Amino acid sequence: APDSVDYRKKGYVTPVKNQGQCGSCWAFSSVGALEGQLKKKTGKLLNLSPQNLVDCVSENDGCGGGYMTNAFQYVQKNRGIDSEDAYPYVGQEESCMYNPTGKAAKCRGYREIPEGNEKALKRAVARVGPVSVAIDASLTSFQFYSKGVYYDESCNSDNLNHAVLAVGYGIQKGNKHWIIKNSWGENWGNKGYILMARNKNNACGIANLASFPKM
Amino acid sequence: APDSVDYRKKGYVTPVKNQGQCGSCWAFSSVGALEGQLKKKTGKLLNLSPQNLVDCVSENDGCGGGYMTNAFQYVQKNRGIDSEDAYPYVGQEESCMYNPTGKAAKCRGYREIPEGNEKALKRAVARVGPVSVAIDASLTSFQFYSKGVYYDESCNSDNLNHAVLAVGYGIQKGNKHWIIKNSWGENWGNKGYILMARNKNNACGIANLASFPKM
Ligand SMILES: *[C@@H](C(=O)O)[C@H](O)C(=O)N[C@@H](CC(C)C)C(=O)NCCCCNC(N)=[NH2+]
Ligand SMILES: *[C@@H](C(=O)O)[C@H](O)C(=O)N[C@@H](CC(C)C)C(=O)NCCCCNC(N)=[NH2+]
Ligand SMILES: [Ca+2]
Numbered sequence A, B: 001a002p003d004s005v006d007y008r009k010k011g012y013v014t015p016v017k018n019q020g021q022c023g024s025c026w027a028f029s030s031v032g033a034l035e036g037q038l039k040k041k042t043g044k045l046l047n048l049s050p051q052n053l054v055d056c057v058s059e060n061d062g063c064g065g066g067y068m069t070n071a072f073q074y075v076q077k078n079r080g081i082d083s084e085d086a087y088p089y090v091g092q093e094e095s096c097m098y099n100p101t102g103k104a105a106k107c108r109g110y111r112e113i114p115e116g117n118e119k120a121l122k123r124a125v126a127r128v129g130p131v132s133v134a135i136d137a138s139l140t141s142f143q144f145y146s147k148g149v150y151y152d153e154s155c156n157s158d159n160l161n162h163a164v165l166a167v168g169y170g171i172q173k174g175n176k177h178w179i180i181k182n183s184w185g186e187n188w189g190n191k192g193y194i195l196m197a198r199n200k201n202n203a204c205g206i207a208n209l210a211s212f213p214k215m
Helices: A025-042 A050-056 A068-078 A118-127 B025-042 B050-056 B068-078 B118-127
Strands: A103-105 A109-112 A131-135 A162-172 A175-181 A193-197 A211-214 B103-105 B109-112 B131-135 B162-172 B175-181 B193-197 B211-214
Touching: A025 A050, A025 A068, A025 A103, A025 A131, A025 A162, A025 A211, A050 A068, A068 A109, A068 A211, A068 B068, A118 A131, A118 A162, A131 A175, B025 B050, B025 B068, B025 B103, B025 B131, B025 B162, B025 B211, B050 B068, B068 B109, B068 B211, B118 B131, B118 B162, B131 B175
Parallel strands: none
Antiparallel strands: A109 A211, A131 A162, A131 A211, A162 A175, A175 A193, B109 B211, B131 B162, B131 B211, B162 B175, B175 B193
């Protein structure tokens, strides 16, 4: 795998979204991974619908939380997921209104990265594209991040509470990192992104719950 | 639905097991629901293997915890689950050693009970058979239960931490309850069972994470 890769430079990443108060991080993380694979397989970059997931992934709990693997399993069983334009995000749970006419992507399954293995996560990001991951984003330092490579020894790798998207990895001034796309709007962090310490003992649990959809 | 049903009286429930220190409650709960459906569809009552689930349901975390829906999805995708005799429980994680020769049951999917709806749970238990459920089993009062219908206002329906099996429901001396099969051995509770308050505002979260396998 290359020493660094940034899928934003390949046009695999859509604009940063804002999930609002709804606990739908899992939906944005899942949509992000699917958007990356969609670009890789079709050549087109499109916004997919997290609301479609929020309202229809019955295995999850809508704004009450959920898992990315569950989301991928839904898309596979449902035979598709709508584009954002065909099923707009409103930040609240509603009845499932999936319309196949607005289908913009399909999923043939998913794969998980070996728990805690950052080397495997690196290889998966290099070979596949953006990967859905989960971290502990409860620290004040995380929420007020603005630049540099984030590391706080207080992060608890066993307290995963927020799903995000690893769109790449690299090194900044000698500090290896993961390029993370968040869903808290373009004004949070560095234009919606945060560089998180890589190879620093699985900081914040970055490699504890990673997965990607098959397409 | 009848005013009461006890599947143990129909021979749909296997002996009470002991999960040990391993956090495999989800595996025993899932196996319990599958054993019930297996009896209903074949007429034979057999012990299914929670170890098969612990070692092979990659979507879960073995002794670190997991979900029943994930377990059912595995059995469906794997095209089967081994009997206990063909894949013995040891209470620790090992590599997946599933052997189709020992297949004792199949799964065609799963269904979830509407969140928090005890009426729906009652109807599901009556029409389907034993149903996998999750509760807050952290209270000292729960752990030292011995008889009667269990109710502790301190139970938190939002703090689900232990999966069990609803093998029936009824009423004891005017107190409506759920007949719950635990996995803490035959010496815990009442021969491994506990009667939990039913229709008392979803006590302990009994109807918050219920599901059953399709067969
Ligand atoms: C994340 C966010 O919006 O900031 C959101 O709370 C979320 O989905 N959190 C997840 C945790 C990460 C994926 C680690 C969560 O809490 N998941 C558990 C959901 C409850 C389990 N039950 C069901 N139905 N799956
Ligand atoms: C229950 C027990 O053994 O007493 C055991 O801890 C367990 O599986 N608990 C579940 C909770 C109930 C089903 C509500 C649990 O903690 N599940 C979450 C597992 C972590 C999520 N990640 C994966 N890989 N599914
Ligand atoms: Ca699942």
